[PDB]
Symmetry: D3
C-alpha cells in the first residue's frame, strides 16, 4: 500500500478523475456515482469509486500544486489507474475568457518545479493523451457546452504572478493559470498512462475572489460531466 493514498488493489478503478479540492470530489461522488465508496481520506486526500452508467469510475483528490498531485498521481498508477483526467478550476489570464466558461487543455506551460525535477531541468511540452484530449473536446462539443481549446500554465507561486505578468503570458497562448496539469501530463507519458485535463474558469487574475456561486458551479458541473463521458469513451 502507498504512503499517501493508502488504498489496496481493487479500490481504484481504470478510469479516474482527479480533483484538487477534496470537496468537489465528494460532491462528484454523491452526485454522479452509484453506491459511491470512499477508499481513502488520509491527508484529506479524499477518494471514491462508484459507477457511472455501469462503468466503474474513480475520483481521487490531488491537492494543490504539482508536488502533491504528482505524489497522488504516481500512487494511483501503482494502484491501477490507467486513464486519469483533471477536473479543476483556473484563473483567466486574458479578458476574452469569462468565468464559468470551460477550457480543454491542449498542453501546459511547465512553470512548476515538480516537472522540472523529473526532467532534470530539460525543456518539455506537457500534453495530454491525444485520445483523452480528443475525447474531452468531443464530449464537450457533443453536449453543447461552450468551451475553449488551448493552453494553460502550471505555476507554483499562487500569489507571485501579477495581472501584468499574466497579460504577457497570454500573448504566448496561455489562457489561464492552474497548478497540476503539467505534472499530470508528464507522469502521464513517463509512466505509460493516458491523462487529460478540463478546467472551469472561476475568476480572472487580478481579483481577490471566485465567481457568483451559480455561474462557476454550473461550470464545475458541466466540466465533471464531459470528463466522465470522455473516460468511458477512451
Amino acid at each position: 500500500s502507498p504512503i499517501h493514498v493508502r488504498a489496496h488493489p481493487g479500490d481504484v478503478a481504470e478510469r479516474v478523475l482527479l480533483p484538487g479540492d477534496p470537496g468537489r470530489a465528494e460532491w462528484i461522488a454523491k452526485t454522479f456515482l452509484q453506491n459511491p465508496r470512499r477508499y481513502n481520506d488520509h491527508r484529506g486526500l479524499w477518494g471514491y469509486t462508484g459507477l457511472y452508467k455501469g462503468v466503474p469510475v474513480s475520483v481521487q483528490t490531488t491537492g494543490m500544486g504539482t508536488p502533491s498531485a504528482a505524489i497522488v498521481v504516481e500512487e494511483l498508477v501503482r494502484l491501477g489507474a490507467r486513464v486519469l483526467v483533471r477536473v479543476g478550476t483556473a484563473g483567466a489570464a486574458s479578458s476574452d475568457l469569462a468565468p464559468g466558461e470551460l477550457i480543454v487543455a491542449q498542453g501546459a506551460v511547465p512553470l512548476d518545479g515538480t516537472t522540472r525535477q523529473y526532467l532534470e531541468g530539460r525543456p518539455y511540452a506537457p500534453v495530454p493523451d491525444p485520445e483523452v484530449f480528443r475525447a474531452l473536446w468531443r464530449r464537450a462539443e457533443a453536449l453543447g457546452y461552450p468551451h475553449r481549446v488551448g493552453l494553460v500554465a502550471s505555476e507554483d507561486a499562487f500569489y507571485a504572478t501579477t495581472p501584468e505578468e499574466a497579460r504577457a503570458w497570454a500573448r504566448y497562448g496561455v489562457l489561464a493559470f492552474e497548478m497540476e496539469a503539467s505534472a499530470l501530463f508528464l507522469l502521464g507519458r513517463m509512466r505509460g498512462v493516458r491523462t487529460g485535463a478540463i478546467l472551469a474558469v472561476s475568476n480572472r487574475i487580478g481579483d481577490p475572489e471566485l465567481a457568483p456561486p451559480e455561474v462557476l458551479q454550473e461550470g464545475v458541473r458541466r466540466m465533471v460531466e464531459v470528463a466522465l463521458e470522455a473516460v468511458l469513451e477512451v
Copy 2:
C-alpha cells in the same frame, strides 16, 4: 517587400504548406497544384503558389532549423499567411516507429535556441493550433495511411543527439526528432495564426543513410495529401 521571402503583396495564399527541403516544395507545387507560380527563389527558399481543388494554396521552403524557419514564417505572415502547416521529415526516437510512418505533431519539445530567444528563456509548450491539429488527425484517418499522433522534439545540433540520448527522450513521450515545429508552433500563437505539423519518419536515430527512397517518397506523398486536405478544413 520582406527581406528573405521576397514575395509581393499578392503572391502568398492564406493556406500554406511548409516543407524544409526546397526540393520537396517544388515537387508538391508540380504534383498537386494547378497553375503553380514560383513567387520567390532568393536564398534558395523556393515558394510556390497555385490552386488546389479550386482553393488557393502556397508552398514555402523554410530551410533547416528554427532560425531559418522563423524568418520564413515571420515573413509569410506579413505576406498573408493564415494557415501554415509543416510538411517535413523526422528521425524516430526509438524502434516502435518505422520509416515512412506518419506523425501528426500534437506538440514539440523545444530543444532549440530560436524559441528560447523568443521566450527569453521562459518555459513553454509548443503546440499547434488545436483546430488544424484536429483536421490533420481526421484526414490522416480518412485517407487511412499508417500514422501516429504525439510529441516530436525540435533540436538544433542534428549531429549531437546520440541513439542512447534519443531513447531517453522516448521515455519522455517523444516519438521522433525534427528541426522546425517548435518555433512554428510558438510563432503561431505569438502572431495569431493557425499552424500545424505533419512529419514522415525518414529513419531511426543512429542510422548512417536513410532507408529505401521509394518507401520514403511514398511516405512523403501521403503526408502532403493529408496536409493539403487538412488545410481546406480550416
Copy 3:
C-alpha cells in the same frame, strides 16, 4: 476572507504551528489545546485555535509541497500570523539519522519551484527567523530530547530522489528531505513574520515504508511539545 483558508481575523492567533497533514493537526489541537476551535476545513486545510498554557495558539494545515504550504502561510499572514513554526516529518538523507529523531531546521536547501518562482531565478539561502530557530534549539536541550541542528532540502518530486542522490546531498549537509520548509523561510522574510521549523524523521529515503509506529508518534509528539513551548517564548 482568504481565498483558501476561509477564515477571518481573530480566528487565527499570533503564534501558529504548521503540520503538513490535517490528521496530525487535529491530534495536536484536541491533545494540547483547550477549547480548540476549527475555524476552517476548506480544501482539507483544517485550521484550529485554542489555549495552550494560557496563550492562544493555532494549528494550520499547509498541505503537501511548498506550493500548498505557500498559500497557507501567505493567508495566515493576511489573517494576522506573526510566529509560524512548521512541525513536520522528513526523510533522512544520511545513514546516521535515526527514525523518530528530531531536526531543528537551520535552513532549507531550495530545490522547489515555489521559492524559485518567488525569487525569479535568484540564488538564496532560506533560513528561519533567528530567534525562533534559537527557541526550538534551546528547548530541545532543556527537554533532553535527542535532536540535530542543520540543513534540510525542500523538493517537489517526492518520488524522484533516489538514495544515491540523497547521500550525495548529505555530503553538503542535507540532513533529510522535506517539502515545505524553504518557502516558509522565504516568505518569513518576504512578509515580515517570524518562522521556524522542527522535523521528525519518519524514514530513510528510498524506503517504501516507515518504522515502528510507536517511535514515529513519540517523535512527533516531542516535536510539538518542543514547538508549542517555543512559539510562546517569541
Copy 4:
C-alpha cells in the same frame, strides 16, 4: 555519402568558403573560381569546387542559422574540409559601422542554441583558428581594404532582437549580428579543422531592409577576395 551534402570525398577541396546564400556561392564560383563545378545542390545547399590561382577551393552554401550551418560544416569535414572560412553578411550593432565595411571576426558571442546543444549548456568562447584569423586580418591590410576586427554575435531569432537590445550588446564589444559564426568556431575546435570568419556589413539594426546596392556588393567582392587570398596562406 553524407545526408545533406550529397557528395563524394574528392568532390570537396581542403580549403572552403562558406557563404550563407547559395546565390553568392554561385556568384563566387563564377566570378572567382577557374573551371568551377557544382558538386551538390541538394536542399539548395549549392556547392562548387574549382581552382583559385591554381589552388583548389570550394564554395559551399551553409544556409541560415547555426543548425543548418552546423550540419553543413560537420559533413564538409567528413568530406575532407581542413580550412573553412565563412564569408557572409551581418547587421551592425552600432551606428558607427556602415554598410559595406568588413569585419574579421575575432570571436562570436554564442547566442545560438546549436552551440549550446553541443556544449550541453557550458559557457564558452567561440573563436576562430588563430592562424586563419590572422591571415584574414593580414590580407585585409595587404589589400588595403579598410575593416574592423572584433566580436560579432550569433543569434537564432533574426526578428527577436530590437535596435535597443542590439546596441545594448554593443557596450560589450559586439560589433554586429549574424547567424553562423559561433557554430563554425566551436566545431573548428571539436573536429580539429581550421576555421575563420569575415563579414560585409549589410545594414544597421533597426532598418526594414538594407542599404544602397552597389555599396554592399563592393563589400562582398572585397570580402571574398580577402578570404580567398587567406585560405591559400594557411
Copy 5:
C-alpha cells in the same frame, strides 16, 4: 606543503580568524595575540599564530572574493584547522544598518561562482556551523555590543550591484553584501569543520569611499573580540 598558504602543519592552530585584508590580520595578531608569529607571507596571504588567553589562535588572510577565500579555507583545513571564523566588513543593503553596526551571519546568499562550481549549479543554503553561529551570537550579547543577526549575500562583482538591486535584495532579507562567507560555509560542510562569520558594516552600497574613520574602526575591534571569545568556547 599547500600551494598558496605555504605554512607548516604545526603553524596553523585549530581555531582561526579569517580577515579578508592582510592589513587587519597583522593588526589583529598584534593587538590581541600574545607572542604572535607570522607563519606565511606568500602571495601576500599573511598568516599569524599566537595565544589568546592560554589558547593558540591563528589569523589567516583570505583575500577578496570566494575564489581566493576557498583556496585559503581549503588549505587551512588540510593544515589541521577545525574552527574558522570570518571577520570581515560588508556593505549595508538597506537604511537600518548604519556603518559600525555588527552582523552575525545566519546564512549567506550564494551570488558567487565558487560555490556554484562546487555545487555544480545545484541550489543551496550556505550556512555556518550551528554551535559556532550560536557562540558568536552569545558572546555579542555577553560583551554587550549592538548587533544584528541575519543574511548577507556573497557576490563576485563588487562594482556591479547597484543601489537599487541592493534594496531589491533587502526585500528578501539580505542585511549586507560581502565577498566570502558563502564559500566558507559551503566548504565548512563539505570538509566537516566549524565555520562562522561576523561582519562590520563599512558603508551603504553606492558609496564612493567610506565613513567616519573613528566608527568603522571601533566596530571592527568589537567584532574581532566577539570572534576571538567565541572560538574559545567551541
Copy 6:
C-alpha cells in the same frame, strides 16, 4: 582615491602589466623596470610604476580570482590605465602542454561568477583586445620563444576541477586553466581599454604541486619580456 588600489592621480601609467602574485610584481618591478617606485600596498595589492626603455609602465597585483582582479582592473582604468595585460600562470588541460611553455590567450572561457554577474547570465566570448593580442603573438615570435596560441578557461574553484574534466575541456579547445582572464577581457570591452594575457604553464591539472623552479622561472621571464615589448606596441 580608489577604495582598494589607493593610488593618487598620475601614479599609474597608461601601460600596465597584471601579475596575480604580489611577489611577482615586485620582482618584475625590480627586474625589468628602471627606477621602480611602489604606489600602493593597501591589501597586499602591490603596485609599481617605473620605466621600460624610457616608457612609463606599471605592474599591479590583481590577487587571485576574478572578483579580485575585477576590482583592481575597475580601479586602474578609473585611474587612467589604458593598456592592461595579464602576465600569470595556468595549469595545462592535457599532456599537450608542458611546464614552462607560454600561452598567448586568444580567448577566455568564462567559468567564473564575476563575468557572469556583470553579464547577468548572458552568453559571451571574452577575447583580448585584437591589437594587443597580436603584439603579444608578434613579440612572442620575434623573441624566438616557443609558445601556443589559443583558449584558456577562467574558473572560480581552484580545487574543484578534476583531471578528467580538464580533459573534457581540452576536447573543446581549452589549453589551460587559470583565474583572471575572463573578467579582464570583459572589462576590457566594457570600459574601453586594451587588454591581453600571456601565461606560463606551471603544471598539469591533477598534480598536488609545481614543476622544476628553474624551468618555470624562465617561462615567467619570457612571458614578462614578451608583455613588456608588446605593451609598447599599442
